Ligand binder design. Sequence first.
Ligand SMILES: Nc1nc2c(c(=O)[nH]1)N[C@H]1C(S)=C(S)[C@@H](COP(=O)(O)OP(=O)(O)OC[C@H]3O[C@@H](n4cnc5c(=O)[nH]c(N)nc54)[C@H](O)[C@@H]3O)O[C@H]1N2
Ligand SMILES: Nc1nc2c(c(=O)[nH]1)N[C@H]1C(S)=C(S)[C@@H](COP(=O)(O)OP(=O)(O)OC[C@H]3O[C@@H](n4cnc5c(=O)[nH]c(N)nc54)[C@H](O)[C@@H]3O)O[C@H]1N2
Ligand code: SF4
Ligand code: SF4
Ligand code: SF4
Ligand code: SF4
Ligand code: SF4
Ligand SMILES: [Mo]
Lengths: 234, 814
Amino acid sequence: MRLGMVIDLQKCVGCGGCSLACKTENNTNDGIHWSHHIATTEGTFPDVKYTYIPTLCNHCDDAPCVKVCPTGAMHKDKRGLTLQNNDECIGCKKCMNACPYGVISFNAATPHRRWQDDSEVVANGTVSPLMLLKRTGATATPNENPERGDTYPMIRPKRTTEKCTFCDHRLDKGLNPACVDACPSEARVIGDLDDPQSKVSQLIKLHKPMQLKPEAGTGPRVFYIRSFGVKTAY
Amino acid sequence: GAELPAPLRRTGVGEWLATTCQGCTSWCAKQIYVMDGRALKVRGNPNSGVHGMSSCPRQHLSLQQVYDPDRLRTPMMRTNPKKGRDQDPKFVPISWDKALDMLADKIIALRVANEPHKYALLRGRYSHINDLLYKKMTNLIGSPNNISHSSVCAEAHKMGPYYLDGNWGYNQYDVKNAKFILSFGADPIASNRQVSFYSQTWGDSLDHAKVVVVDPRLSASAAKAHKWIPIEPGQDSVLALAIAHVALVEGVWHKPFVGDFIEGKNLFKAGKTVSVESFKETHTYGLVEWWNQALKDYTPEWASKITGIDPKTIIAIAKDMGAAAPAVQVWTSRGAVMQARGTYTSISCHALNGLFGGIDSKGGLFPGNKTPLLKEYPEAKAYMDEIAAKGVKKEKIDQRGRLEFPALAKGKSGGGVITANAANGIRNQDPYEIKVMLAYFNNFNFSNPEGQRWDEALSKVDFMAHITTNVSEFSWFADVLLPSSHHMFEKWGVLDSIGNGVAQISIQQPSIKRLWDTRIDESEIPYMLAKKLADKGFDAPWRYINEQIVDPETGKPAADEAEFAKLMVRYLTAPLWKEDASKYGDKLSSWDEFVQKGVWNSSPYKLEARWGKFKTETTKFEFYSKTLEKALQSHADKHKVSIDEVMKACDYQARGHLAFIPHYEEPYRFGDESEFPLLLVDQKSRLNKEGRTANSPWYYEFKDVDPGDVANEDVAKFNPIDGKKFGLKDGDEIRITSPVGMLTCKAKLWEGVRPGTVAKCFGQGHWAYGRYASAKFGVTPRGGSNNDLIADRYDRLSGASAFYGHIRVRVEKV
Ligand SMILES: Nc1nc2c(c(=O)[nH]1)N[C@H]1C(S)=C(S)[C@@H](COP(=O)(O)OP(=O)(O)OC[C@H]3O[C@@H](n4cnc5c(=O)[nH]c(N)nc54)[C@H](O)[C@@H]3O)O[C@H]1N2
Ligand SMILES: Nc1nc2c(c(=O)[nH]1)N[C@H]1C(S)=C(S)[C@@H](COP(=O)(O)OP(=O)(O)OC[C@H]3O[C@@H](n4cnc5c(=O)[nH]c(N)nc54)[C@H](O)[C@@H]3O)O[C@H]1N2
Ligand code: SF4
Ligand code: SF4
Ligand code: SF4
Ligand code: SF4
Ligand code: SF4
Ligand SMILES: [Mo]
């Protein structure tokens, strides 16, 4: 089994809804986005092309982040996913240097520290992050998703790395990744690339698949098909 | 920690509750995922026939609005009797009873003094239960001044559809079946009125539709289009008119809709008039008169000289649209039409929807489907006393209907709101002073052009109360703050949406326990205020509510605030769930089923339904708008002048016949071009939930999803040509100055900007709202406020404020 994702760039409108869904799903600290993007502008006016490429962990066939991890915290599971036992992460950052794609973040900052602020913009009138935290019963942020704790810390400790888990906790329940459900055009599809009849397997035979940095030799399993833009008419 | 054992796992077991998003007038049906009493996720309501589960990205930002750490938790009163941008209000907390006591005393004082018309109700956003607070309460008090925000929105965008085919309203666009899409400034995968559905369909549609986007900037939509036309701001109608000209010369109008020459031969030759009697129109009126009076001379070469567009491109577009007809749809955005002469851009662009037959056709555009939703509570005439009956006849504070403010909504002189001009009437106490103001869900100091005029106006109002979640810029000037329960998570309401060939009606309901000591703007607060007014000797609002707004099943009035909030929605939606709505769409068995599904869908639109029966003077699609002539004649007769004198008084160039046909108005411009060499291209952020996500950190974290923009910054985008000309580099702190004001932000060089323009998102520049949206709350803004640059100007035929085309600016570093 080799789970992976196919992203249809013609369907994609570059809105970031996938990345925002990832924020709500996985309780990433402010500034940490497991799902993100690579956007480029090319050409000189008036012949200008803008392209948006959504990015995530490619859950590689030959993951360097796994090979360099001294504790074994970063590992492959039986679905082909690259996951992390956060409890065994010593924050050495070797995975970040080994990953060619820059999709791993390091919790140098105390996650959700801004919610400990108890100042009020209008005293005894407006509320505060800390008060809102107390009112809702949340531990770190009122937006924290408890589902995440099924398989991974809902709130990660400082001095650990983290990245896209392919919403493994949702897959365990037979559900879809949050970013897949969040896409208005159904541009994102996941499946078993070892199953020739899966939608993903058929998509990359029906369309020419493209990968990010295949020359790095990791065998990424996020594939891009088609084109964000179209050739200019007239 | 270890993975949890299956009996203790939590993924997927929470509850989904239906509501409606209002980040834009798409008004998408949603479900909220709730666990441990907290809202954790938003998704599109799968039962929605318009958009299904599809959503734009802003749905997730909703979660940082309800859980905004700068929301008000209590009513407040200011203790600084002075008001002003420089005056700290020194708000202190008070009870609801005390806050409404204060407001109630001021209202009753107006009535005792026979000046009820000096009360004003200001409405920003709203739901379809607004009639009580907006209209009925206001008129029962005795005021004509229920002032919506419609004219700072898109009323100019309704002029074409109304005066050509009788629709004072918006259209849905049949993208799934389109063969040609021509967008004058619309960016439907980022803004406009069904971002979820048009984002769902846009990329797929490129395989069967040729798409041209006309916009001074390379928008997301233009980046996914076959042609980007980087029009000079305010010149859109030149292209629309030349397309129509070529269509006639080439003989490729849609004959099943328009008609044809009696003898078959195409007699339209460039520059030469045609006999009206030689053509037989079918469902249109005025084609030949339009040609003879103007269109015969709107050649591709004439258009190329003004716009720089290749005439071969104009010709090729016209032919492509002819071959695609009737699967042709022309979009207009605020950008094209919210200009001082923009009524005729709406008309000129929308005329193409008739000429190529797209109106009410497959692949074209058409109005929202009919639904049985009620929009008003019962008439209140029997509850109007003599004080109220006299007050409601006074001239409105926004001066609608004066010679220079026709505001011809639905064909009526003084028929339309003039939101931005209410500040001027208040400012000048013309027609009279406003002494008591209630406002909700609005922030006109920030959202209206030259909003400092609202700073001034509000500082001159004896008593104002603001119904709001946050202390926004408008709130700064309030005497009393009345904190609103959040519309999307703590409120009963009802909304609608159109697209995908259907109209839907969706519920708003509380999905969490109310966080703070707030009340629902449109139900609980007017209810509580009516009780307070009745306690003080004015019980007409209370009697109206208790006798006329009763449960559709039990016939009983509400027993308390919470019951009334739901009753307001039950009453207007009863035709959907109490009665059989099968004739219009879904059959619902009960109120509970309506709430559980969360949405009612109409049947699919019947194509060509309006052909031959438009609500125009002729009942035809009017290229020569007898409908508009009649409205202008009414206004002219009212003021004892000719129509031409109305045109002159309203700073339009049209005279004679040109007042009634698609024609070219040179765009109005303000300021010396030598001193102010750049044209502002105002745009929305695709992460703006109107003016309400600037206090959401996730907004800034992903701000570069706006093509060309920069995460965690407010940037103005310049073409590198102008960057070199003005010595600008990426990241430079800059000041942008217009004749009426200035702002500071950062510079970004981007080739997707037409040279000679500067493209900058509206949405930042808050100095209040919250700690993330401002640098120093109440003092110093984050980013720059676009509307401080935009001179207070109007499309006087519609009443609309102008946000585009006339704004000249200069830029400098630091
Ligand atoms: N993301 C987001 N979407 C929204 C909203 C929001 O707040 N945020 N608000 C909703 C609301 S209330 C409204 S009324 C609708 C409005 O939706 P629209 O009427 O479709 O237009 P705007 O979204 O206001 O965007 C204006 C566009 O016009 C362009 N333009 C500016 N000047 C000119 C010109 O002179 N000629 C031409 N051809 N184009 C010009 C700007 O670049 C910009 O792309 O959007 C709704 N959709
Ligand atoms: N330069 C520029 N100006 C524009 C636009 C643009 O594109 N460019 N778009 C214009 C358009 S299309 C629109 S329709 C107008 C809208 O203009 P407005 O109607 O003034 O809307 P907002 O700016 O969003 O202000 C709404 C305010 O309601 C309060 N509030 C926030 N959330 C809630 C809630 O849940 N309940 C209640 N009771 N109150 C709440 C806050 O005070 C908030 O500032 O702005 C317009 N102005
Ligand atoms: S949600 Fe879908 S359309 Fe939007 S950026 Fe992500 S993949 Fe693209
Ligand atoms: S994308 Fe990077 S983090 Fe993800 S599996 Fe590959 S090497 Fe590891
Ligand atoms: S930072 Fe953690 S996951 Fe990465 S290599 Fe070091 S121990 Fe392994
Ligand atoms: S698969 Fe899940 S963890 Fe990965 S980017 Fe999508 S939402 Fe985030
Ligand atoms: S912001 Fe507008 S388009 Fe986006 S989900 Fe909300 S209502 Fe729909
Ligand atoms: Mo609007």
